Design a protein around this nucleic acid. Structure first.
Lengths: 61, 59, 206, 263
RNA sequence: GAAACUGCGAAUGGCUCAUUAAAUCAGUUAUGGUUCCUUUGGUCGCCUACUUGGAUAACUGUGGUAAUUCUAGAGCUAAUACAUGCCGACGGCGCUGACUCCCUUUGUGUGGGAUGCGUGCAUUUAUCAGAUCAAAACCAACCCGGUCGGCGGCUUUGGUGACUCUAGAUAACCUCGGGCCGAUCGCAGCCCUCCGUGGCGGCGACGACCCAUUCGAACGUCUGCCCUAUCAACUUUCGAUGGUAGUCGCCGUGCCUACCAUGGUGACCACGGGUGACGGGGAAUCAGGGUUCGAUUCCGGAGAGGGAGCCUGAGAAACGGCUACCACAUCCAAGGAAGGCAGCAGGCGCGCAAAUUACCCACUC
RNA sequence: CCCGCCCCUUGCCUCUCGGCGCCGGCCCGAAGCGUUUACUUUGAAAAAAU
């Protein structure tokens, strides 16, 4: 019971922010995560990516 | 100094005492009825022992 | 003041222990009653949780009993004779539980005479003649035979009692702590107990 | 400090199942002395401003109790820290409402509203039989009531229905296998299931197996068992979930299945 | 409605970590060895009663000391303070037996009986009961079914694993001057062979006895502890270990006393010494295993300058209670009087090292 | 790797009191336990905060 309930709710949260696919969703793919995917989900990155800026330096301001 | 209010309290003082005695009467009365009814069951147990000896013998 | 602590004094290995706290009030000690024979003097001591303990000094009466024939009458307590706890108390006439004392022995005779309708051992036949023969024979007649006949073929009374009875003395055993109860009470000796303490007495003194 | 009995109770050693916070001050209510055990109580004020939110401050609860709208077991109580516990009925007659104190499946006193019809009696465990002077018997219950002249066939670990007004029990159960029970103490709490078996030892406690109708077996000490009615036949109205008790995996699944957390 | 008597609380909290190495403390168990303000529930009928007795304060008035939250003298008046004590309902129960009555001479089978004493709970002592296992055959005295040889049929409170338990019976004891069984108060009504009495009823408030319960308290079980052998034998009538009886205490117990026995513990580390040692829940670091720290918000303990003793109370060996010594230190008319911040602020001193003489009961209790 | 069988199979009986049976008679669950521990596995039991 510990492995099921924990893993399910862990992976749910990784999917909810979208640093992980649901075409993955196994505990092994947690380990395939890396630094850059987190940093992509940051607000200033998403401002730049999907809204008006001229550089990343603009977007933070 | 006694006033009418005083005298009421002295009548009520004894009314309660008498009432208390009357309640211990009726409770024990009902309990005796109930107790004596069951002690059917007592009779039944004795009857059962006698019956068992006869029944066992019955061949 | 005087303590009743368990945290003074050694432990098993001969080690010592030391205090860590001052004497608590659930450990208490108030000196012995040392009650004697004399007129009733009682002091009331309040104790823990409330409650009263009567401490009696100079008792003179106890409710003894002769439970073989089931009479218990109030009788005077004359003197101590033997105390197995200590010898010194006997010399100084101090009363505590499980002493051996002397009593008046009077009401027991009155009880016997009235119930079994037969006298005790007597000094002489002229002893009873003025009074104590006018209540030993009575106008009832009307249970001269009907009552008395079953009292004429039961009761022996034991020898060791009877020789003392004449003197007006009987040997009874204090049962109750007088210092806590505020009363002396007891039972009168019989049988092998009465043989035992006779021998202890006779060994030690006359 | 130990020259006498204490009177304060903190918040951070308070019995945890009253669901208190900790950013209000150091003290918590403290149950005052009464019929139920201190741990097993729910103080009055916690039902009235930390559950149903009639009041918002403790002074407000005092202002309710003073006007005497509150009853407990048909009598009037007027403290703010009256120690009501398991199997009592609260009765506010200025709303027409009646509550019952019973255990949730997660082991905490819930709100279980009921008919006025049910709210005229409660279930009381027998704990001791004691012959008083002049050959009279007695009962003693967990709500600490002494009911004189009981009929002799009632024994301990049985339960009796009591009429709040008059005493004088209406019915009773005699403890045995195949009777429906609720758990009231122990690490299991609020679970419902039939008795199934008992076990006896000579002194040093004894245990009592239980099994429910969902196929789970569990056990508890003897003195945490309480009878509620005949086999598969409750004589009380039960709060939702019915004492079955799910695991956390299944319980999660329900909320995301209906996809409901508001309505 | 100030004052004052009376009731209740001040034994909670707060603060500090000095002592304290099987002690404290933690987990586990036990009171069948005990106490318990309070709450809750039961318990509450063997020339006065239309109500008993006499003083104290505030108050009034007069004072004393260098000086105090000192206190004297005089004059009043209360009670849920203080001290007393009857009514009602005893148509009952047991033991004496003046006697008396009937039938078999008697005995015995009989029926009644005046006069007495005892007769609730609590208290102390003694005694009795606390019963139910497995069946018959005859002889002696005997009930009923039933007869002028006797055949078949009866006798028993409750409860625990276990109690010398609980309740019952008998004989007494009585705490007096120091157990109980109401001389108390507020809201609102009635009925009278009837004219405000005689009758009686509601709703509360208060007090008290015992049992249960709650909050605990106190003793006791098993297991668990840091360093040291340049600490290896220790403990005993200045009780060490045990036995018997008693004293004392809330109870169990060498807790204490008398008499008696000669034991107890240790290389599986006792005993002794050390600790910049209060214990635990925990904290820091860390792969796994560990190491170090824990004065400090929760829980338990100990202590209020050092010691000892004690009053009141249900609860205290209390210190924002008291009494004394020792150590400090203050006032004084030098005769005497008064004191304890390891409570919140604040100051001195100590040091490497640590805050505002603030606002307020609105929240939490 | 849960019932049984070769001799054993949760080792036995003895039974008696309170249920289940089948047609007075018969069968099988609960009662003493398997020489003792450790070990292992499951329950009960555990203050909160962290």
């Amino acid at each position: 019971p510990r492995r099921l309930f924990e893993g399910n709710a862990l992976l749910r949260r990784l999917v909810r922010i979208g640093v992980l696919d649901e075409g993955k969703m196994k505990l092994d793919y947690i380990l395939g995560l890396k630094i850059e995917d987190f940093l992509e989900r940051r607000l200033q990155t998403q401002v730049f990516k999907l809204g008006l800026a001229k550089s990343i330096h603009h977007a933070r301001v | 100094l006694v006033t009418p209010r005083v005298l009421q309290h002295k009548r009520r003082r004894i009314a309660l005492k008498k009432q208390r005695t009357k309640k211990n009467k009726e409770e024990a009365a009902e309990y005796a009825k109930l107790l004596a009814k069951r002690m059917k069951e007592a009779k039944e147990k004795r009857q059962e022992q006698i019956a068992k000896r006869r029944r066992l013998s019955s061949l | 003041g005087i303590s009743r602590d368990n945290w003074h004094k050694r432990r098993k290995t001969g080690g010592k222990r030391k205090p860590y706290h001052k004497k608590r009030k659930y450990e208490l000690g108030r000196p012995a009653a040392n009650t004697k024979i004399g007129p009733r003097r009682i002091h009331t001591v309040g104790v823990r949780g409330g409650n009263k303990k009567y401490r009696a000094l100079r008792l003179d009466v106890g409710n003894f009993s002769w439970g073989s024939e089931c009479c218990t009458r109030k009788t005077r307590i004359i003197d101590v004779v033997y105390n197995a706890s200590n010898n010194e108390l006997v010399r100084t006439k101090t009363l505590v539980k499980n002493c051996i004392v002397l009593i008046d022995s009077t009401p027991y005779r009155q009880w016997y005479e009235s119930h079994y309708a037969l006298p005790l051992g007597r000094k002489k036949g002229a002893k009873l003649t003025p009074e104590e023969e006018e209540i030993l024979n009575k106008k009832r007649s009307k249970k001269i035979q009907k009552k008395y006949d079953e009292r004429k073929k039961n009761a022996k009374i034991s020898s060791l009692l009877e020789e003392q009875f004449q003197q007006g003395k009987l040997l009874a055993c204090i049962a109750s702590r007088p210092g806590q109860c505020g009363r002396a009470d007891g039972y009168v000796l019989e049988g092998k107990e009465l043989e035992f303490y006779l021998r202890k007495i006779k060994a030690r003194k006359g | 400090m130990a020259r006498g009995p204490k009177k304060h109770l903190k918040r951070v050693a308070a019995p945890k199942h009253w669901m208190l916070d900790k950013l209000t001050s150091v003290f918590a209510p403290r149950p005052s002395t009464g019929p139920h055990k201190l741990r097993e109580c729910l103080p009055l004020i916690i039902f009235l401003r930390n559950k149903l939110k009639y009041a918002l401050t403790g002074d407000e609860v005092k202002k309710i109790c003073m006007q005497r709208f509150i009853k407990i077991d048909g009598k009037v109580r007027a403290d703010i820290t009256y120690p009501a516990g398991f199997m009592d009925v609260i009765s506010i007659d200025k709303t027409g409402e009646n509550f019952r104190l019973i255990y949730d499946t997660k082991g905490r006193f819930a709100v279980h509203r009921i008919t006025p019809e049910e709210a005229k009696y409660k279930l009381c465990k027998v704990r001791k039989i004691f012959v008083g002077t002049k050959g009279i018997p007695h009962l003693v219950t967990h709500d600490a009531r002494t009911i004189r002249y009981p009929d002799p066939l009632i024994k301990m670990n049985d339960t009796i229905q009591i009429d709040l007004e008059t005493g004088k029990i209406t019915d009773f159960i005699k403890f045995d296998t195949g009777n429906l029970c609720m758990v009231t103490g122990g690490a299991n709490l609020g679970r419902i299931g039939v008795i199934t078996n008992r076990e006896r030892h000579p002194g040093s406690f004894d245990v009592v197996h239980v099994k429910d109708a969902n196929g789970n077996s569990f056990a508890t000490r003897l003195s945490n068992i309480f009878v509620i009615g005949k086999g598969n036949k409750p004589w009380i109205s039960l709060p939702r979930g019915k004492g079955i008790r799910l695991t956390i995996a299944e319980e999660r699944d329900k909320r995301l299945a209906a996809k409901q957390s508001s309505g």
